[PDB]
A paper describes a structure:
The main/3C-like protease (Mpro/3CLpro) of severe acute respiratory syndrome coronavirus 2 (SARS-CoV-2) is responsible for making 11 out of 14 cleavage events for liberating and activating the viral non-structural proteins essential for the virus replication, and accordingly, it is an important target for antiviral drugs (1–4). Clinically relevant SARS-CoV-2 Mpro inhibitors, including nirmatrelvir, the active component of the Food and Drug Administration-approved drug Paxlovid, and ensitrelvir, which has been approved in Japan for the treatment of coronavirus disease 2019, target the cysteine protease active site of Mpro to competitively block its catalytic activity. Multiple studies have identified an Mpro mutation (E166V) that confers strong resistance to clinically relevant inhibitors, including nirmatrelvir, but the underlying mechanism is not fully understood. Glu166 is also hydrogen-bonded with the N-terminal Ser1 of the dimer partner to stabilize the Mpro homodimer and intramolecularly with His172 to stabilize its active site.
Of the several proteins screened, Mpro with four amino acid substitutions, namely, T21I, L50F, S144A, and E166V (hereafter referred to as QM for quadruple mutant), yielded high-quality crystals, allowing for structure determination by itself and in complex with nirmatrelvir, ensitrelvir, and bofutrelvir at resolutions ranging from 1.71 to 2.33 Å. The structure of Mpro QM in complex with nirmatrelvir shows the inhibitor covalently bonded to Cys145 in the active site, as observed in the wild type, as well as various other mutant Mpro structures with nirmatrelvir. A superposition with the wild-type Mpro structure bound to nirmatrelvir shows that the positioning of the pyrrolidone ring occupying the S1 pocket is minimally affected, although a hydrogen bond between Glu166 and the pyrrolidone ring is lost due to the E166V mutation. The side chain of Ser1 in turn forms a hydrogen bond network to bridge between His172 and the pyrrolidone moiety. The main chain atoms of Val166 are engaged in β-sheet-like hydrogen bonds with those of a 3-methyl-valine group of nirmatrelvir that mimics the P3 residue of the substrate, as observed for Glu166 in the previous structures. However, the trimethyl (tert-butyl) group of the 3-methyl-valine side chain shows a significant deviation in its positioning compared to the previous Mpro-nirmatrelvir structures, shifted by ~0.8 Å away from the Val166 Cγ1 methyl group to mitigate a steric clash (yellow/green in Fig. 3B). The substituted amino acids and the surrounding residues are well resolved in the electron density map, except for the region including Phe50 (L50F) in the nirmatrelvir-bound Mpro QM structure that has weak electron density and is presumably disordered.
Residue numbers in the entry:
A (entry chain A): 1 to 49, 51 to 303
B (entry chain B): 1 to 301
Write the structure that this text describes.
Amino acid sequence: SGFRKMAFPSGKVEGCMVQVICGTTTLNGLWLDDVVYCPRHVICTSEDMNPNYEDLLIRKSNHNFLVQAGNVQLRVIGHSMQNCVLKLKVDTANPKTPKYKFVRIQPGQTFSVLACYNGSPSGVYQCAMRPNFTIKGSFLNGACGSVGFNIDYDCVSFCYMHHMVLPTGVHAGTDLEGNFYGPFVDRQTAQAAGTDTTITVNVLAWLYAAVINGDRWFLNRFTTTLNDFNLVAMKYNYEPLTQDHVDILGPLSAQTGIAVLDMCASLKELLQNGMNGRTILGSALLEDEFTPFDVVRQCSGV
Amino acid sequence: SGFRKMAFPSGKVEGCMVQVICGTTTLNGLWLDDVVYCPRHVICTSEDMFNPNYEDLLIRKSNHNFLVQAGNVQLRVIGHSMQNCVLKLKVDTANPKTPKYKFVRIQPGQTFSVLACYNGSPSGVYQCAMRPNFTIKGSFLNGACGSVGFNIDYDCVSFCYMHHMVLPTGVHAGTDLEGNFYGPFVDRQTAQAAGTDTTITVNVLAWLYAAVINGDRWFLNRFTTTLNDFNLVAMKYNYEPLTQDHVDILGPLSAQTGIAVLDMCASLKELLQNGMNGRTILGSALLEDEFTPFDVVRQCS
Ligand SMILES: *C(=N)[C@H](C[C@@H]1CCNC1=O)NC(=O)[C@@H]1[C@@H]2[C@H](CN1C(=O)[C@@H](NC(=O)C(F)(F)F)C(C)(C)C)C2(C)C
Ligand SMILES: *C(=N)[C@H](C[C@@H]1CCNC1=O)NC(=O)[C@@H]1[C@@H]2[C@H](CN1C(=O)[C@@H](NC(=O)C(F)(F)F)C(C)(C)C)C2(C)C
Ligand SMILES: [Br-]
Ligand SMILES: [Br-]
Ligand SMILES: [Br-]
């Protein structure tokens, strides 16, 4: 009953967040086993932009880094730069390290963000990797080091670490190996995201969520082909729908008795006519940050 | 940068969630120190749907009818009492991860984070508002009862909600942690209806301030108005009346934007009487009312 933008429980990640201080710069780190992962621009100041990280790191020693888990100080015994993240080796292993893995998500996938400041968790919310490799998050100054994650069984899959905000108000970051999502660099210079698109497979998953919860006015008796659908979808800046996407919506087709191409034809008419002052799941816009798997998980058993 | 529906970190509450089994019925409980709190209808079955005599059913139940499971460790019940619609199960083991907490009764218009759980395992977290009709617009499946809503005020977890039922319109109802329902609802399967809901005016205003802080300012005009004149219009659109308390609580956001509260009221009045001009505010084509002034301040610090 009901459908909400839902984040994963953040407990397993809260126990890994620490404060990383280097000189006057403070951000968050991720403490897993005896390593703290954090954005490399912690070694910079307003002075340090060409943010030539190589030089800045060379002049640093281990005592220049203060890692704080709450009030307990963790001693740094090593420091290394892997792409855009800094790996600080510490003498103490995190006793709350969950079973984890580092994954690189694809555009269209969703994840939970634990927004932190000064190593202290502030809030949790759900995001999606946009097609242009940005995310529409909520981050303030000092938020860098906050991570995005999924919980798969008992395993925390870390997929995002926050680095910067672009002039359009969207956010950009890396995986836990320091590799940015999208064509961005961790330097304050003129950078742009690129035209974003609507995640079509997710809109369809959300329309299936609407049917499961009673909203079914947008359903029509028409059907269509994938190519005919994609021809219309291109015009409205929608991502093209693939046969993989059709198969992943199968569970929702099974739960509703509505064929995917029948839902595609219902989506086609909504795009060309609008909602006529009506709402879908209490929204006057089409929502695209629910994957089919999110919908299946949330509507399980209805 | 950006504005999202943001829940509190749920870690402190995840460590209090347990499974309560009574016969064939399984739901969630809240384990604080040596007491487990759960909805009393865990002692019922489909048979008891007609005249559910909880007093009777509970006395007919003993301690061995309750199986409490914290992960794999079973907690033995050594006492049980019924406070209104919640059951207090005395257990032999105290939760070593019990946070500093208090039980509070929230007011309509206030928000809280919900930790949705099933079989004692936390599944997801999201933010909710206590609607003016004392329902909440949540997402719960079978077995979700016992899930709790909470706020974190400094170092204290303030528990304010325990989930009990879904109403025919798809909205949800529950009690505070003292067993007293929010709204005119009872914990039995009988004909119940929520009642006409209204829009939380002070929250819409706080959300308009959040949009201005984040760059959205097309709805800003040079107009202003009075409290009474605004309320005369808002009443027509099924908006809750704005009080001077609400005007004072929007003060922090007026300070952050330099926009007087009554000027933002005049912007909302125009939005109500003219529409949103096919435009969006913070990515919404409707006015949002589930962000309190505190939620915005905390997120936009
Ligand atoms: C991490 N602590 C912050 C997070 C930012 C601050 C405001 N909200 C956020 O999401 N990240 C930064 O300050 C990074 C950091 C230097 C500059 N920077 C930026 O986000 C800047 N933006 C850009 O350079 C742009 F637009 F190109 F993306 C800033 C102008 C400060 C907003 C580094 C190393 C990239
Ligand atoms: C707790 N585990 C469930 C949660 C429900 C199930 C589906 N989604 C939810 O939020 N609560 C219940 O099953 C409660 C429980 C008996 C009946 N009930 C209901 O929610 C029923 N609704 C009503 O009686 C109504 F409409 F009046 F609110 C039901 C018909 C099963 C949906 C008790 C003791 C209230
Ligand atoms: Br939502
Ligand atoms: Br404008
Ligand atoms: Br007046």
